[PDB]
Scaffold this motif. Structure first.
Motif, PDB file in Angstrom:
ATOM      1  N   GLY A  69      -2.240   3.619  -4.701  1.00  0.00           N
ATOM      2  CA  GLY A  69      -2.818   2.109  -4.784  1.00  0.00           C
ATOM      3  C   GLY A  69      -2.859   1.529  -6.242  1.00  0.00           C
ATOM      4  N   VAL A  70      -3.046   0.216  -6.224  1.00  0.00           N
ATOM      5  CA  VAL A  70      -3.064  -0.491  -7.474  1.00  0.00           C
ATOM      6  C   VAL A  70      -4.407  -1.497  -7.281  1.00  0.00           C
ATOM      7  N   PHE A  71      -5.153  -1.737  -8.301  1.00  0.00           N
ATOM      8  CA  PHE A  71      -6.393  -2.432  -8.299  1.00  0.00           C
ATOM      9  C   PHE A  71      -6.519  -3.499  -9.131  1.00  0.00           C
ATOM     10  N   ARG A  72      -6.951  -4.574  -8.871  1.00  0.00           N
ATOM     11  CA  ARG A  72      -7.172  -5.822  -9.873  1.00  0.00           C
ATOM     12  C   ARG A  72      -8.571  -6.432  -9.625  1.00  0.00           C
ATOM     13  N   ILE A  73      -9.452  -5.949 -10.664  1.00  0.00           N
ATOM     14  CA  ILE A  73     -10.670  -6.393 -10.624  1.00  0.00           C
ATOM     15  C   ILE A  73     -11.048  -7.735 -10.916  1.00  0.00           C
ATOM     16  N   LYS A  74     -12.153  -8.474 -10.318  1.00  0.00           N
ATOM     17  CA  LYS A  74     -12.524  -9.705 -10.905  1.00  0.00           C
ATOM     18  C   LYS A  74     -13.701  -9.321 -11.972  1.00  0.00           C
ATOM     19  N   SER A  94     -13.007 -17.885 -10.776  1.00  0.00           N
ATOM     20  CA  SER A  94     -12.537 -16.606 -11.267  1.00  0.00           C
ATOM     21  C   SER A  94     -11.261 -16.021 -10.315  1.00  0.00           C
ATOM     22  N   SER A  95     -11.190 -16.585  -9.123  1.00  0.00           N
ATOM     23  CA  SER A  95     -10.261 -15.945  -8.129  1.00  0.00           C
ATOM     24  C   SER A  95      -8.901 -15.578  -8.740  1.00  0.00           C
ATOM     25  N   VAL A  96      -8.331 -14.381  -8.086  1.00  0.00           N
ATOM     26  CA  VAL A  96      -7.128 -13.890  -8.729  1.00  0.00           C
ATOM     27  C   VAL A  96      -6.314 -13.531  -7.315  1.00  0.00           C
ATOM     28  N   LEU A  97      -4.837 -13.471  -7.786  1.00  0.00           N
ATOM     29  CA  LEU A  97      -3.927 -13.075  -6.971  1.00  0.00           C
ATOM     30  C   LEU A  97      -3.167 -11.814  -7.437  1.00  0.00           C
ATOM     31  N   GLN A  98      -3.109 -10.810  -6.544  1.00  0.00           N
ATOM     32  CA  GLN A  98      -2.480  -9.620  -6.767  1.00  0.00           C
ATOM     33  C   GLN A  98      -1.144  -9.796  -6.331  1.00  0.00           C
ATOM     34  N   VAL A  99      -0.225  -9.231  -6.911  1.00  0.00           N
ATOM     35  CA  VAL A  99       1.517  -9.340  -6.529  1.00  0.00           C
ATOM     36  C   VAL A  99       2.008  -7.951  -6.865  1.00  0.00           C
ATOM     37  N   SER A 100       2.621  -7.289  -5.787  1.00  0.00           N
ATOM     38  CA  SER A 100       3.163  -6.077  -6.124  1.00  0.00           C
ATOM     39  C   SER A 100       4.620  -6.162  -5.421  1.00  0.00           C
ATOM     40  N   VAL A 101       5.598  -5.795  -6.265  1.00  0.00           N
ATOM     41  CA  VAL A 101       7.011  -5.823  -5.624  1.00  0.00           C
ATOM     42  C   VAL A 101       7.275  -4.222  -5.273  1.00  0.00           C
ATOM     43  N   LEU A 102       7.678  -4.016  -4.294  1.00  0.00           N
ATOM     44  CA  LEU A 102       7.710  -2.785  -3.407  1.00  0.00           C
ATOM     45  C   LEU A 102       9.370  -2.485  -3.014  1.00  0.00           C
ATOM     46  N   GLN A 103       9.801  -1.327  -3.284  1.00  0.00           N
ATOM     47  CA  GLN A 103      11.180  -0.946  -2.989  1.00  0.00           C
ATOM     48  C   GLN A 103      11.129  -0.051  -1.831  1.00  0.00           C
ATOM     49  N   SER A 104      12.131  -0.279  -0.728  1.00  0.00           N
ATOM     50  CA  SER A 104      12.061   0.514   0.567  1.00  0.00           C
ATOM     51  C   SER A 104      12.694   1.935  -0.214  1.00  0.00           C
ATOM     52  N   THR A 105      12.259   2.902   0.218  1.00  0.00           N
ATOM     53  CA  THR A 105      12.745   4.272  -0.099  1.00  0.00           C
ATOM     54  C   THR A 105      13.948   4.636   1.225  1.00  0.00           C
ATOM     55  N   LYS A 106      13.728   3.682   2.474  1.00  0.00           N
ATOM     56  CA  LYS A 106      14.460   4.038   3.364  1.00  0.00           C
ATOM     57  C   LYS A 106      15.923   3.215   3.534  1.00  0.00           C
ATOM     58  N   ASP A 107      15.830   2.113   2.735  1.00  0.00           N
ATOM     59  CA  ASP A 107      16.971   1.353   2.899  1.00  0.00           C
ATOM     60  C   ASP A 107      17.243   0.419   1.262  1.00  0.00           C
ATOM     61  N   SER A 108      18.008   0.986   0.363  1.00  0.00           N
ATOM     62  CA  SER A 108      18.277   0.480  -0.900  1.00  0.00           C
ATOM     63  C   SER A 108      18.283  -0.871  -1.147  1.00  0.00           C
ATOM     64  N   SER A 109      18.743  -1.878  -0.006  1.00  0.00           N
ATOM     65  CA  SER A 109      19.044  -3.279  -0.212  1.00  0.00           C
ATOM     66  C   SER A 109      17.574  -3.835   0.122  1.00  0.00           C
ATOM     67  N   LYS A 110      16.335  -3.038   0.412  1.00  0.00           N
ATOM     68  CA  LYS A 110      15.368  -3.805   0.848  1.00  0.00           C
ATOM     69  C   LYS A 110      14.261  -3.505  -0.123  1.00  0.00           C
ATOM     70  N   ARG A 111      13.749  -4.848  -0.587  1.00  0.00           N
ATOM     71  CA  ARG A 111      12.526  -5.026  -1.568  1.00  0.00           C
ATOM     72  C   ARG A 111      11.703  -6.060  -0.744  1.00  0.00           C
ATOM     73  N   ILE A 112      10.450  -5.901  -1.259  1.00  0.00           N
ATOM     74  CA  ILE A 112       9.474  -6.969  -0.447  1.00  0.00           C
ATOM     75  C   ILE A 112       8.447  -7.020  -1.545  1.00  0.00           C
ATOM     76  N   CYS A 113       7.951  -8.358  -1.688  1.00  0.00           N
ATOM     77  CA  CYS A 113       6.972  -8.957  -2.344  1.00  0.00           C
ATOM     78  C   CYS A 113       5.577  -9.002  -1.583  1.00  0.00           C
ATOM     79  N   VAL A 114       4.597  -7.933  -2.196  1.00  0.00           N
ATOM     80  CA  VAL A 114       3.275  -8.126  -1.348  1.00  0.00           C
ATOM     81  C   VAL A 114       2.250  -8.750  -2.167  1.00  0.00           C
ATOM     82  N   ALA A 115       1.754  -9.901  -1.602  1.00  0.00           N
ATOM     83  CA  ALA A 115       0.689 -10.747  -2.358  1.00  0.00           C
ATOM     84  C   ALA A 115      -0.597 -10.400  -1.455  1.00  0.00           C
ATOM     85  N   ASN A 116      -1.783 -10.384  -2.506  1.00  0.00           N
ATOM     86  CA  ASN A 116      -2.960 -10.219  -1.808  1.00  0.00           C
ATOM     87  C   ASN A 116      -4.009 -11.232  -2.589  1.00  0.00           C
TER      88      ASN A 116
END
Ligand SMILES: [Mg+2]
Length: 434
Positions: free
Chosen positions: A197-202, A257-279
């Motif tokens: 995991g990754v954490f973004r505190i306010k 003070s609202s924040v946006l967390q953004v993480s770009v992940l790469q599929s270890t199962k399909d090399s062509s697959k990346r996904i941008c996960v925002a929270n």
């Protein structure tokens, strides 16, 4: 040499609830390490004699037969080539009876196993920060119907650990995560079950995103504060320009003070697959409709930049506590791609802060769990505030893990309760790559 820099057990241990030790390992790996759990040979033996259990895993789930016994963990750090010096740690508490039922028990029938490579099990959950839940106001005004012991951090964390690990999820987006909750409860439990995991505190709490390592690797992070991005990043110059004739509304947005967390992940199962996960966790005030619209416009422009400019067109998952029901301007804007200048939410807090404007976006987003009757249920209020928004260009809904029944939600009047550790309900859905 392999060595445990941190070795800690929870203070509260319950039968049927996983005991997730904190293990911070230097020069080594948990897969290369040795674990063995023991239980007191007899109740009240004061740890004089120990009985080996058959559990050789990092996590131990006590049975009802263990109630009244202390536990002990032996662990030998290893790196795949050698071992370091062995360590042992005893619980100070005895195993206790836990709640009879939890709202997530039935939900776990829908999440029996880790999903196949074609799926992404996704969770969004506002877990109620102890920074807020610990106060006299929370105990006596907000949640007087809740057993005070059930509001306490150690109790709620045990349930949250059981709940989240039981979902066997791939992407977990959380809101209202306290700094110590991230490092001492979520990281030890979720890493034991294969998530990082990754954490973004306010200030005292914030956002966390966890991802299953067997399905994903973290490529990059693009977190922002909405006020900083809107006032200083030229990416949002057109939106800042729309706010020039509305200085009162602009000042209220920029204060948040609202924040946006953004993480770009790469599929270890399909090399062509990346996904941008925002929270995110948008501004909460009931009269803050225009603020949430402007925050959402910044968020979507930021996510468009990350997913289409920084990366050459990757799909998006956007989780969060949006503090917006489906009848709002913010929800209409997300789903329809536009909002008219005359929308009533542009004057959500009166004339002084009125900020009528037209907004457009080109994402095709669907609320994966639809529009439940509510995702937040407290004394005096209920509403659907949480969503898992999915990019329809690349993702589809395989299944929605049903929310607890209204009977389950109202057994102890409202939430949180002895059977539910937050005032919100976790959203869980299985997504499929198109
Ligand atoms: Mg809250």
């Amino acid at each position: 040499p392999p060595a445990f820099t941190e070795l800690q057990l929870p203070r509260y241990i319950m039968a049927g609830f996983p005991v997730c030790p904190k293990l911070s390992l230097e020069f080594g790996d948990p897969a290369s390490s040795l674990f063995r759990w023991y239980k007191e040979a007899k109740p009240g033996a004061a740890g004089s004699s120990w009985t080996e259990t058959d559990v050789e895993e990092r996590v131990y789930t006590p049975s009802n037969a263990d109630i009244g016994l202390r536990l002990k963990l032996h662990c030998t750090p290893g790196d795949g080539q050698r071992f370091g010096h062995s360590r042992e740690l005893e619980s100070v508490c005895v195993v206790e009876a836990g709640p009879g039922t939890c709202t997530f028990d039935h939900r776990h029938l829908y999440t029996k196993k880790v999903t196949e490579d074609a799926l992404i099990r996704t969770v969004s959950y506002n877990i109620l920060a102890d920074t807020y839940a610990q106060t006299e106001f929370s105990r006596t005004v907000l949640y007087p119907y809740c057993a005070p012991y059930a509001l306490e951090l150690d109790y709620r964390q045990n349930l949250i650990q059981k709940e989240l690990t039981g979902y066997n999820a791939d992407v977990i987006c959380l809101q209202e995560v306290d700094r110590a909750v991230f490092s001492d409860s979520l990281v030890p439990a979720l890493e034991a079950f294969g998530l990082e995991g990754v954490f973004r505190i306010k200030q005292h709490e914030g956002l966390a995103t966890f991802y299953r390592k067997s399905k994903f690797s973290l490529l990059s992070q693009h977190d922002i504060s909405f006020y900083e991005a809107l006032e200083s990043d030229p990416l949002h110059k057109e939106l800042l320009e729309k706010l020039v004739l509305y200085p009162s509304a602009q000042e209220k947005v920029l204060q948040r003070s609202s924040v946006l967390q953004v993480s770009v992940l790469q599929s270890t199962k399909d090399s062509s697959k990346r996904i941008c996960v925002a929270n995110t966790h948008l501004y909460w005030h009931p009269k803050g409709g225009y603020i949430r619209l402007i925050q959402m416009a910044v968020a979507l422009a930021h996510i468009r930049h990350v997913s289409c400019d920084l990366y050459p067109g990757i799909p998006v998952i956007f989780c969060g506590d949006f503090n917006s029901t489906p009848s709002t301007g913010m929800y209409h804007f997300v789903i329809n791609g536009s909002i008219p200048e005359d929308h009533e939410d542009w004057a959500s807090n009166g004339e002084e802060e009125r900020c009528n404007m037209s907004l457009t976006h080109f994402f095709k987003l669907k609320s994966a769990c639809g529009e439940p009757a509510y995702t937040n249920y407290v004394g005096g209020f209920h509403g659907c505030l949480d969503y898992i928004f999915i990019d329809l260009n690349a993702l589809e809904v395989e299944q929605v893990i049903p929310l607890p029944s209204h009977e389950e939600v109202t057994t102890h009047q409202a939430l949180p309760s002895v059977s539910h550790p937050s005032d919100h309900i976790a959203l869980v859905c299985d997504l499929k790559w198109k």
